[PDB]
Design a protein around this nucleic acid. Structure first.
Length: 492
DNA sequence: TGTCCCTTTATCTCTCT
DNA sequence: AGAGAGATAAAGGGACA
């Protein structure tokens, strides 16, 4: 018989009991743990189910899922129960921060390393605990933490990086490898190729990483000679998450996209400049003619969909849904293009297809309003949040459907929506702001932290801002959100 | 196999003018 | 407002006991 059979059975028995108290985990959550944390993680969740739930620690089920659904998830759970009190009272971290650190492969190692290295990183290297938490909140945080401690001097002194840039580089998966590769390749990338330290930090600062830097060093001549690409363009391909793969794929598919399809280098660079650029490029070469086929979709419109995060997923979804969205929903091809032209366009397209009829028929929005909401990054989240909260915002808080659509039609719309309905009563009733004012602040990107920063100022007044009225604080907050408040705050 | 670390991709949020 | 940047997550491979 199959050997996995016995272990799957135990997996399923143990799973059954977790649907009960005190955790009550649905299916998606149970799968999640089994998939990444494994069988033992599902068992450890059960074994510890009582200890984590209520006092002392008081962790929501979501948080227990978050910690368990990773490799070594069992070890993380044991370690969280043991160290969270330690890190909160002896180091001053919030429980949210402990959970963040815990919620990655090797979570146990990261927690035990923060416990061990945080004093020396703040005392001797002058890092903040916020910085130490960030570095620790990725896979191999233990490694990045030890590497930071070992290389923060030499990287600042012999190479001229600020501690912020060392922290910025370190705060990614594979953090240890990026740091080591910057130590080695920073003089080569700066002195030989005329790159700024900041451009190099950007190339290093994210998931890839050590591969991006090494691939930039390798392919930067070949690219700026034959294809006549600017160094700036090469940095942009490498620094945007496309990394190694995006560069290698630009090298291949630049002539092919240009010649056969009449794209400029510029359009190719912009397609490559995001997570999975390689995926976007190869998808373009493969799908552009199918999209523009006897019709039809124009080239430039295929490039726009491509010049975005998950462009590949966007492109494929467009190929599959353009027909049903136009035909059975009365959308124009221009509207489908605009929905897809954001990070997570795939998510937004599917969410429009599934919710457009419901938001119209049951909530009284136009298709235009639905499309407007969808046409921002995170568009899916925003449409799901309009569906849940439109009745509560309108009925309990006084808001018009127009205002709600306005709040939701920005990146982070979801966050703004939840924040408005959560903070509107105290802002208006307790401090005399008008709903219109609250709606105004929230009707921008960064709406949530803009709202939060006003509440913070009106309930624990920083003297630095006292010379500003509510109307002024509101005007400032509409202008530049939390950053402008903070910028102003650093003047009192 | 369980654990740890690294890399790629996709998605969501906020900044910065 | 759109380019750029940082956060967060899912998933699969190398590595080792």
């Amino acid at each position: 018989q199959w050997s996995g059979a016995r272990a799957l059975e135990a997996l399923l028995t143990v799973a059954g009991e977790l649907r009960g108290p005190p955790l009550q985990l649905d299916t998606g959550q149970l799968l999640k743990i089994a998939k990444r944390g494994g069988v033992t993680a599902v068992e450890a969740v059960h074994a510890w189910r009582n200890a984590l739930t209520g006092a002392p620690l008081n962790l929501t089920p979501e948080q227990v899922v978050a910690i368990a659904s990773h490799d070594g998830g069992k070890q993380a759970l044991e370690t969280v129960q043991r160290l969270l009190p330690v890190l909160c009272q002896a180091h001053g971290l919030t429980p949210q921060q402990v959970v963040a650190i815990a919620s990655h492969d090797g979570g146990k190692q990261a927690l035990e390393t923060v416990q061990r290295l945080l004093p020396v990183l703040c005392q001797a290297h002058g890092l903040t605990p916020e910085q130490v938490v960030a570095i620790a909140s990725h896979d191999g945080g233990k490694q990045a933490l030890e590497t930071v401690q070992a290389l923060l001097p030499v990287l600042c002194q012999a190479h001229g990086l600020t501690p912020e840039q060392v922290v910025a580089i370190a705060s990614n998966g594979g953090g240890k490898q990026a740091l080591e590769t910057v130590q080695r390749l920073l003089p080569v990338l700066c002195q030989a190729h005329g790159l700024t330290p900041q451009q190099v930090v950007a190339i290093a600062s994210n998931g890839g990483g050590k591969q991006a830097l090494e691939t930039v060093q390798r392919l930067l001549p070949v690219l700026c000679q034959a294809h006549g690409l600017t160094p700036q363009q090469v940095v942009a391909i490498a620094s945007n998450g496309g990394g190694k793969q995006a560069l290698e794929t630009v090298q291949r598919l630049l002539p092919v996209l240009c010649q056969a399809h009449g794209l400029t280098p510029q359009q190719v660079v912009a397609i490559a400049s995001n997570h999975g650029g390689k995926q976007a490029l190869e998808t373009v070469q493969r799908l552009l003619p199918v999209l523009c086929q006897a019709h039809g979709l124009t080239p430039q419109q295929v490039v726009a969909i491509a010049s975005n995060g998950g462009g590949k997923q966007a492109l494929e979804t467009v190929q599959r849904l353009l027909p049903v969205l136009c035909q059975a929903h009365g959308l124009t091809p221009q509207q489908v293009v605009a929905i897809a032209s954001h990070d997570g366009g795939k998510q937004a397209l599917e969410t429009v297809q599934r919710l457009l009829p419901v938001l119209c028929q049951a909530h009284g929005l136009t298709p235009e309003q639905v499309v407007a909401i969808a046409s921002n990054g995170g568009g899916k989240q925003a449409l799901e949040t309009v569906q849940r909260l439109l009745p509560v915002l309108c009925q309990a808080h006084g808001l018009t459907p127009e205002q709600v659509v306005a709040i939701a039609s920005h990146d982070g719309g979801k966050q703004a929506l939840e924040t408005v309905q959560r903070l509107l009563p105290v802002l208006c009733q307790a401090h005399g702001l008008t709903p219109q004012q609250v709606v105004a602040i929230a009707s921008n990107g960064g709406g949530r932290p803009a709202l939060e920063s006003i509440v913070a100022q009106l309930s624990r007044p920083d003297p630095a801002l006292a010379a500003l009225t509510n109307d002024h604080l509101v005007a400032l907050a509409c202008l530049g959100g939390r950053p402008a408040l903070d910028a102003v705050k650093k003047l009192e």
